[PDB]
């Protein structure tokens, strides 16, 4: 028979938050919580892969003293043309015995290049992402790591404390319905469907899977008449759409996405998107709590602030004097929301003093500090910092 503590923290990674657990008839408990990572992994469905194409051109069939015939071959971008009145030459003279009536059959088709296994872009259909969170909790003087789906259903138990993370206040994702993945880079792209690729553009060659034998090709391959007395297969074709996309893609989602999203691959995911808030439910077990009577009683409390600087970090120092009934551990917490204390728990003993670190934005900070079950008023004159800009949240 434990106690359920419910709180809400902003969805911001690298910011430690202090939460006061107050179970009636039990000594207050301070828990430090920090989001280590927030992962948004969408479900992917591979439509096709694209890469550099290869124009397969065999040796042309030069039929000496005869007419060659083109046949319809079921190959991607298959092109065939028979050229009449040819008289090709090799180093030792004319290849054909006849002066006239010689034909050259030029043939070509498109297939995946040898590079397609190494250099390729994948077209995915991205739908309904599952939100996951890694949370660091300073629990019983030790740091515990909780990894749970931020759906408000996935219960994760660490050291008998049951954690329920979420649901996320924002269902926002930096990924659109259709995405393109190239190595470690992800792009939001309304890519052409399979069998709709255009010449010289992304998808000029389309392969459903990287192992696929048959491919779609639309490269505008047109065979030309060979040069006088020359054996070769001249042609006109739109350059590689994949090579063109590689230089025209622009900046990836890692650089363009709002809310400071970090984009990773294998699997494709959005990491640390600073959007909305995250509710946290902690079912703290019975054994973790200490009764008020079993906890030290504090009296004759006084607070002095010898040094303070109002900044994003703990620029304030406070010395709190006390009279404790017995030796033991006391939770330290700020009763004013404008001031936050670095220390969550300190050891007390009789007529002694404690030193705490605090953070505030106020020039004149008047705050109350609750050490165990007794409150003390702190008066602080905080000074401005050296820099207007900082490199931490």
């Amino acid at each position: 028979g434990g106690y359920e503590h419910v709180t809400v923290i902003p969805n911001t990674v690298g910011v430690p938050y202090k939460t006061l657990v107050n179970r009636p008839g039990y000594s207050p408990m301070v828990l430090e919580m920090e989001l280590l990572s927030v992962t948004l992994e969408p479900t992917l469905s591979l439509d096709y892969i694209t890469c550099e194409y290869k124009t397969v051109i065999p040796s042309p069939y030069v039929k000496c003293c005869g007419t060659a015939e083109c046949k319809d071959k079921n190959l991607p971008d298959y092109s065939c043309k028979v050229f009449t009145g040819v008289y090709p030459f090799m180093w030792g003279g004319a290849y054909c015995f006849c002066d006239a009536e010689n034909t050259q059959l030029s043939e070509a088709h498109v297939e995946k290049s040898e590079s397609c296994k190494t250099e390729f872009a994948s077209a995915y259909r991205a739908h309904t992402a599952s939100a996951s969170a890694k949370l660091r909790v300073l629990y019983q003087g030790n740091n515990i790591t909780v990894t749970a789906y931020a759906n408000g259903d996935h219960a994760v138990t660490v050291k008998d404390a049951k954690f329920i993370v979420g649901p996320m206040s924002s269902a926002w994702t930096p990924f659109d319905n259709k995405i393109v993945v190239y190595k470690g880079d992800v792009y939001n792209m309304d890519y052409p469907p399979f069998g709709a690729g255009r010449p010289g553009q992304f998808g000029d060659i389309q392969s459903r899977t990287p192992e696929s034998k048959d491919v779609y090709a639309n490269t505008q391959l047109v065979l030309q008449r060979p040069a006088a007395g020359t054996v070769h297969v001249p042609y006109s074709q739109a350059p590689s759409g994949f090579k063109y996309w590689l230089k025209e893609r622009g900046a990836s989602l890692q650089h363009t996405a709002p809310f400071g999203c970090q984009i990773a691959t294998n699997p494709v995911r959005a990491v640390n998107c600073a959007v909305g808030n995250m509710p946290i439910s902690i079912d703290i077990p019975e054994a973790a709590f200490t009764r008020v009577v079993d906890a030290p009683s504090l009296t004759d409390m006084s607070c002095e602030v010898p040094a303070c600087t109002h900044s994003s970090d703990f620029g304030g120092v406070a010395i709190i004097k006390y009279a404790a009934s017995k030796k033991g551990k006391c939770a330290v917490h700020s009763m004013t929301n404008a001031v936050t204390i670095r220390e969550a728990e300190i050891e007390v003993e009789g007529n002694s003093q404690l030193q705490i670190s605090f953070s505030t934005a106020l020039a004149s900070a008047e705050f109350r500090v609750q050490v165990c079950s007794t409150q003390v008023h702190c008066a602080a004159e905080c000074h401005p910092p050296k820099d207007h800009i900082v490199n931490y949240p």
Binding site: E52, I57, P58, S59, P60, Y61, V62, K63, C64, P88, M90, W91, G92, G93, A94, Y95, C96, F97, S113, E114, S115, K117, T118, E119, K183, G184, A227, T230, V231, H232, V233, L246, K247, A251, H255, T256, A257, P258, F259, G260, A274, S311, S312, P385, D387, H388, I389, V390, N391, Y392, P393
Partner: protein, 401 residues
């Protein structure tokens, strides 16, 4: 058990009945057998066994001497520019230039064979090219690759060259023959390789940021990538025919010659012996040497063999494309000064460095610029925060106090 086909029989691919020295015994028959198994999954097991020669009249075993170059040969093919803009039948003709490697390495295919001698033996200091009717030996040192300026050759094996080239609009591959005569082939090729990372640098660093990149591996081994091969077409040779008083005399010289005359009687035929064509003139005849004992790359610059149909073989090639790691330098951290919701950076780049920035809120407003020299940048830091990426360095994050 992997099975291969020979006429009306099936046999284990690794064990053809012609063993040992299949090619040495019957070169035409071996190539025909290999062509018949081109679509079979055990083709490479058959290619390995058929092109390996460990004869009986030998003390030791040479069972690992598989040499594909015993079946293949260097050749002459069309080149649009052999020097001074004039086309020729080049012994260094350009077939295909591959530039899929993001590291900038070019995989070049030529009509000659590097690292192989005329006797098929492997020698890195040598090169074999087609000299008129017969292949000849040349020095590897004389081989050169150039675009707008000379290239750095990183690897050579058979028809393939690996080269690191400066920016250009053409690609030239050449060599110097036995007679000290230079031969070159120029093709129009736009070479301007894209930047690996976010910094345009000249020399390769020992240490830096590890970024994914592709290259053509310097390994001489041929296991993944492949090319199509087939028997060469008939080689025209006017020297085979001579005027015997007032008639035509075809001298074969121990070769198989296909001849055709614009005269009566036995005007055509595939002869192995000398033939005479009476009441005929030398200009009325056409003579060519047949090549059924050798293989040649399926070149679109060389005609197909008229006798055989769609008969073809396949051989593995060196230097396949593979995913590797490219080390990139990290630009020195700029001198940073602060102001109210503002960040000021004094950028000192040693080479072109990409500067990018975005707001960490709802409206990121992504902006980018390539910084060439000394430039002071004034950036607004919103309440949501600002993320700045300077070259290959990890992104800097800024927030107001």
């Amino acid at each position: 058990p992997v099975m291969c086909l020979l006429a009306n029989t099936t046999f284990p691919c690794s064990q053809p009945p012609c063993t040992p020295c299949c090619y040495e015994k019957e070169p035409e028959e071996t190539l025909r057998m290999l062509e018949d198994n081109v679509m079979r999954p055990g083709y490479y097991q058959l290619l390995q066994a058929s092109l390996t020669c460990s004869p009986h009249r030998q003390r030791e075993s040479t069972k690992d001497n598989f040499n594909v170059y015993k079946a293949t040969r260097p050749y002459l093919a069309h080149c649009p520019d052999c020097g001074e803009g004039h086309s020729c039948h080049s012994p260094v003709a350009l077939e295909r230039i591959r530039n899929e490697a993001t590291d900038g390495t070019l995989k070049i295919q030529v009509s000659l064979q590097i690292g192989i001698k005329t006797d098929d033996s492997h020698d890195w200091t040598k090169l074999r090219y087609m000299d008129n009717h017969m292949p000849a030996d040349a020095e590897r040192a004389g081989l050169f690759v150039r675009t707008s300026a000379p290239c750095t050759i990183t690897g050579t094996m058979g028809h393939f060259i690996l080269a690191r080239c400066p920016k250009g609009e053409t690609l030239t591959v050449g060599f110097t023959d036995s007679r000290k005569i230079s031969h070159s082939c120029t093709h129009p090729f736009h070479h301007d390789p894209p930047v690996i990372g976010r910094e345009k640098f000249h020399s390769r660093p020992q240490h830096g940021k590890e970024l994914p990149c592709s290259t053509y591996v310097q390994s001489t081994a041929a296991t993944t990538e492949e090319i199509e091969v087939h028997m060469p077409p008939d080689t025209p040779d006017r020297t085979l025919m001579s005027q015997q008083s007032g008639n035509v005399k075809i001298t074969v010289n121990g070769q198989t010659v296909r001849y055709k005359c614009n005269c009566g009687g036995s005007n055509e035929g595939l002869t192995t012996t000398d033939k005479v064509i009476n009441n005929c003139k030398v200009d009325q005849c056409h003579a060519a040497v047949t090549n059924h004992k050798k293989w040649q790359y399926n070149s679109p610059l060389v005609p197909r063999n008229a006798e055989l149909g769609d008969r073809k073989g396949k051989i593995h090639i060196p230097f396949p494309l593979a995913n590797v790691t490219c080390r990139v330098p990290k630009a020195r951290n700029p001198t940073v000064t602060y102001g109210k919701n503002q960040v000021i950076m004094l950028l000192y780049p040693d080479h072109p460095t990409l500067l990018s920035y975005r707001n960490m809120g709802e409206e990121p407003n992504y902006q980018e610029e390539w910084v060439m020299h000394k430039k002071e940048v004034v950036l607004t830091v919103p309440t949501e925060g600002l993320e700045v990426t300077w070259g290959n360095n990890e992104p800097y994050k800024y927030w107001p106090q």
